């Protein structure tokens, strides 16, 4: 039965792709989605029989790399941590599959889309169920491959091609660290499996000989793993791809940009919990990077005027928050916020797509005005999703953001205080641009054109049921999961998540709260609401357009161009690489320099020496 | 041209295994850094040279050069797994490079241009060739699940166990492998279609469709289950690594 | 001089820069109830001189206008999605007019 | 010119007349080959832990509560 959870999406994808001419644009739509929904039901059954009936399930199919004491196997780890993400991936994947059939009814190449989606579902199921680093590495690379294929769904679209290529290169440079990590942890344990290193992961205490100087061993491994997670979580290092990734279709973006591949980098840390806690040095830099990325994205999203672009920066801010949660040994709030996020940002993505494709395929803030009363359903949906996003008190998002900020405040380490400050000041930014999105659309005089309003058509029923399900979820799941999994020592995780005795600050994160800091992010939220309403509804005569002399237009450009990262990084790394791959390697190394030994280098040498020898 | 990179390229590299490593046990150890400092910079310089290339044939040859320079690192790193991974990578490369040159030659036998500038938007037509080309590019892209990744993962493992510096430079090779091969794939069979140059063109008939079938089946077979290849030669690699010394 | 080629260039640049200024005014003015007053201000600014006859007093004016206009650009200007630069440019372009596909290729005898 | 190219994964708007008939076969095809995956997995899924409550997987499985000791692997 447990094999049916993973192999059915692959089988559906393979049969749909091979026989996409035998099945119409609707046969594959009703077949692959049905297979994915069956897989989701199987995942729910596994969750009932594992999460509540606490007994993890283990298996091994066949040896992949049966070399000497490097046993690689096709086994899976159906663990308590894994099955929660089984639910998260399967439910959202099935809902996205139901979402796309309405959207793709007009897009010609329909069956290829569900084929790609099912490939992605199979790859990430293989990743999350995996138990070996290398066998998890195939899922890690397959997620990137499916991301490239889906963003490259529009081969004619020139921008999509460049975005896909750049995404592949940056993701490769990112998971470079994780790829080094597999064989870094192998040279100390002579094994690659999870159960044989989490049993004894604290024993090694020696050093290494790296490229420059001798450093720590476990800390270096954890640093490499975090650098690998950077590429798949859009951290401070390489987050050039996600802001430009929304050049493809919408229904996939609800699954690849804000729901599941989001979870890859954080789940890297979450799965290997009893490895980072024994490397305190890596935890501190992880916290720095997570807080920096979260703040950077939160202040990035505010200026942009597109539906998908701004919410990508919100996703990156949640990435930073979750990376910090995984950086302070408080992995509980990390997975709790992951489960919440996969609901209240996938819902917002579906709502944004519904309002985009129903309005003549326009995604803008400057041009589109207000049409809230034209259709109340998906606006009510997106309002619920936003209320979760800000984390209004006693909602799904509150039970994660409040506790994660409190945990940030409690830890007095040099990274805990700094990152708590950064999160507190980023709450204002996120509550500002979320309500900016709520206001610049649907709450202003309509600035659109007179033809698109006439051609208005609400969300079709088949695409509204996933929204209904997500709205039902991200209003009760927070309350249902607050007690059962973050409840001061809940006994269902077992070995899935291990927290060291020393760095366990949970009870004093609730019973030592000053009550002047726990309820403060609601205060920044309401202040952001006030300032956004004032600027974007009434006081916009001078607070909106700033036609000053200098230092204010450049302030606009600095955040619009996202700190010129796409400029400085490009020109100083890839432009230089492309220049010196033609004017250095192809000039003074092989062609031209040592080519004085091939044609025209020695051929003319023997046109003089051999000539003056007959006479 | 499909056996210059097929079997004519494996003589010297395999010649190292049979007539250099067990022959001169005390000299390879003394010359190990020289081979490292040659191959590590080769995988970088050749890969960078690959990017600024226009001919369709030359890019595949340069990728082959990079793959051979990578396998040379794992061969001289004397490990029971390094040499086995070297042999797996050499077999996988013999498959994938052969397939890639057939894929880029079937285009030449119809249009005779050998220029990426003319080629473009070949997914709107001949989709079967596009699918085959994408699969073989992924195999050259060094993805797990294909026989190559089994090939260079063992190379990296063998190199890192001996020297930490060489492994990072070698893995820079598989990082940079995504810069030219994927760019070629997106610039040849996924661009904007131009009727000015490619006025008319057909797709693969029954001959070249069956040609790639053994390549595909062998690729998948040695990628997902490389046990038999490693099973058949664990004794010989063990004998080759343990030679001259007695500890 | 009596050559209208120079002045036709002036009557061309004025319309081009006015159109670009109105576009940028629309971009900066996200809300429109300020866009009316801003557009009125731009139109009135273009009527400040409205009487130039000398050729020596136009090049400096056009240079100053171009320099001032380029100082604020709204780094994210409006482009129609199907326009050359939009969000669905080359979404699903019409297939090329004349291209044929031969069937029996690679046969023998 | 779209009709000339095969488009193995289906054309842009490939709509066969009997697509329901093919979909019935395709869905039946998945089910018949899914059984060997389920049947072959029954000899697998070793879980030495005994759940506090009975699950519904005892009928087709027996690899639970048996692999207790770890001294004879």
């Amino acid at each position: 039965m447990y094999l049916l959870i993973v192999f059915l999406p692959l089988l559906g994808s393979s049969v749909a792709g091979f026989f996409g001419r035998f099945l119409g644009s609707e046969g594959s739509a009703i077949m692959t989605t049905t297979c994915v929904s069956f897989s989701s039901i199987l995942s729910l059954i596994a969750f009932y029989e594992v999460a509540l009936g606490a007994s993890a399930c283990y298996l091994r199919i066949a040896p992949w790399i049966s070399s000497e004491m490097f046993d690689a196997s096709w086994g899976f780890l159906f663990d308590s941590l894994t099955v929660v993400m089984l639910i998260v991936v399967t439910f959202i994947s099935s809902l996205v599959h139901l979402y796309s059939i309405s959207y793709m009814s007009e897009d010609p190449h329909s069956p290829r889309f569900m084929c790609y989606l099912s490939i992605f579902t199979f790859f990430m199921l293989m990743l999350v169920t995996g138990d070996n680093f290398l066998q998890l590495f195939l899922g890690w690379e397959g997620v990137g491959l499916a991301s490239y294929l889906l963003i490259h769904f529009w081969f004619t679209r020139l921008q999509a091609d460049k975005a896909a290529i750049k995404a592949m290169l940056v993701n490769r440079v990112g998971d470079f660290g994780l790829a080094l990590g597999i064989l870094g942890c192998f040279t100390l344990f002579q094994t690659v499996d999870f159960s044989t290193i989490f049993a004894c992961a604290s024993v090694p205490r020696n050093s290494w000989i790296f490229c420059n100087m001798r450093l720590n061993a476990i800390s270096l491994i954890c640093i490499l793993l975090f650098i690998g997670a950077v590429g798949k979580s859009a951290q401070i290092g390489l987050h050039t791809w996600l802001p430009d990734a929304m050049e493809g279709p919408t229904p996939v973006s609800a699954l690849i940009h804000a729901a599941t591949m989001v979870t890859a980098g954080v789940f890297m840390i979450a799965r290997c919990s009893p490895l980072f806690e024994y490397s305190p040095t890596a935890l501190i830099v992880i916290t720095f990077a997570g807080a920096m990325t979260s703040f950077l994205a939160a202040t990035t999203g505010i200026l942009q005027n597109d539906l998908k672009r701004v919410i990508a920066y919100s996703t990156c801010s949640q990435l930073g928050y979750m990376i910090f949660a995984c950086g302070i040994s408080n992995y509980s709030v990390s997975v709790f916020h992951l489960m919440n996020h996969a609901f209240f940002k996938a819902l917002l993505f579906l709502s944004a797509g519904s309002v985009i494709h129903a309005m003549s395929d326009e995604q803008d803030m400057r041009k589109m005005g207000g049409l809230a009363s034209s259709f109340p359903l998906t606006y009510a949906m997106m309002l619920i999703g936003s209320l979760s996003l800000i984390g209004f008190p006693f909602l799904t998002g509150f039970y994660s953001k409040d506790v994660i900020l409190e945990l940030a405040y409690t830890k007095y380490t040099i990274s805990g205080n700094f990152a708590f400050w950064l999160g507190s000041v980023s709450v204002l930014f996120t509550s500002y641009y979320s309500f900016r999105l709520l206001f610049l659309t649907f709450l202003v005089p309509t600035n659109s054109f007179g033809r698109d309003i006439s051609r208005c058509h609400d969300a079709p029923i088949p695409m509204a049921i996933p929204l209904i399900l997500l709205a039902l979820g991200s209003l009760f799941v927070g309350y249902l999961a607050k007690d059962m999994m973050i409840g001061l020592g809940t006994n269902f995780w077992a070995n899935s998540l291990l927290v060291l005795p020393k760095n366990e600050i949970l009870a004093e994160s609730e019973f030592a709260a000053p009550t002047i800091i726990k309820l403060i992010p609601i205060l920044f939220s309401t202040l952001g609401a006030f300032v956004a309403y004032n600027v974007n509804l009434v006081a916009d005569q001078f607070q909106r357009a700033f036609q000053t002399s200098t230092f204010c237009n450049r302030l606009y450009s600095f955040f619009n161009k996202r700190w010129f990262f796409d400029q400085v990084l490009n020109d100083f790394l890839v432009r230089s690489f492309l220049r010196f791959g033609y004017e250095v390697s192809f000039e003074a190394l092989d062609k031209g320099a040592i080519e004085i030994l091939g044609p025209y280098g020695i051929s003319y040498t023997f046109r003089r020496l051999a000539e003056r020898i007959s006479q | 041209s499909v056996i210059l990179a097929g079997i004519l390229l494996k003589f010297g590299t395999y010649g190292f295994l049979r007539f250099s490593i067990p022959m001169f046990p005390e000299a390879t150890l003394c010359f190990t850094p020289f081979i490292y400092t040659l191959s590590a910079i080769a995988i970088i310089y050749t890969s960078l040279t690959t990017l600024r290339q226009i001919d369709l044939k030359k890019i595949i040859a340069y990728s082959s050069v990079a793959h051979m320079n990578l396998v040379t690192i794992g061969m001289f790193s004397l490990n029971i797994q390094g040499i086995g991974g070297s042999i797996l990578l050499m077999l996988s490369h013999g498959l994938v490079s052969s397939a890639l040159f057939l894929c880029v030659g079937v285009l030449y036998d119809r249009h005779k241009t050998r220029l990426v500038r003319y080629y473009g938007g070949l997914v709107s037509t001949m989709p079967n060739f596009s699918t085959i080309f994408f699969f073989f590019t992924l195999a050259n892209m060094s993805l797990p699940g294909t026989s190559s990744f089994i090939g260079e993962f063992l190379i990296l493992v063998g190199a890192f166990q001996r020297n930490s510096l060489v492994a990072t430079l070698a893995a820079l090779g598989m990082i940079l492998g995504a810069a030219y091969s994927l760019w070629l794939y997106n610039r040849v069979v996924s661009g904007n279609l131009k009727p000015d140059f490619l006025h008319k063109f057909s797709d693969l008939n029954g001959r070249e469709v069956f040609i790639f079938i053994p390549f595909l089946v062998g690729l998948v077979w040695m990628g997902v289950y490389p046990k038999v290849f490693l099973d058949c030669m664990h004794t010989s690699v063990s004998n080759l690594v343990q030679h001259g010394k007695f500890h | 001089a009596a050559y209208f080629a120079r002045r036709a260039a002036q009557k061309e640049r004025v319309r081009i820069l006015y159109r670009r200024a109105l576009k940028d005014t629309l971009n900066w003015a996200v809300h429109r109830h300020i866009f009316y007053r801003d557009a009125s201000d731009l139109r009135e600014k273009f009527n400040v001189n409205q009487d130039v006859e000398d050729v020596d007093r136009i090049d400096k004016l056009i240079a100053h206008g171009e320099a001032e206009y380029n100082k604020w650009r709204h780094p994210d200007p409006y482009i129609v999605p199907w326009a050359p630069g939009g969000s669905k440019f080359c979404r699903n372009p019409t297939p090329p007019a004349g291209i044929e596909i031969v069937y029996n290729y690679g046969l023998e005898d | 010119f779209r009709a000339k190219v095969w488009s193995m994964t289906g054309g842009p708007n490939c709509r066969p007349k009997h697509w329901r008939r093919n979909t019935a076969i395709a869905m039946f095809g998945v089910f018949l080959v899914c059984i060997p995956i389920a049947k072959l997995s029954a000899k697998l899924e070793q879980r030495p832990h005994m759940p506090v409550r009975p699950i519904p997987s005892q009928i087709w499985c027996k690899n639970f509560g048996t692999k207790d000791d770890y001294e004879k692997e």
């Binding site: 001419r21 035998f22 609707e26 009814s105 | 057909s202 008939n205 | 290729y105 | 054309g11 709509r15 007349k17």
Partner: peptide, 27 residues
Amino acid sequence: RWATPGHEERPKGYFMNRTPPAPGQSR
């Protein structure tokens, strides 16, 4: 549009671009 028959007599394109012969004879 889930009940109307498809507007396709045959899947578009030829397998390996080989035109099928007249009915009755082999390949």
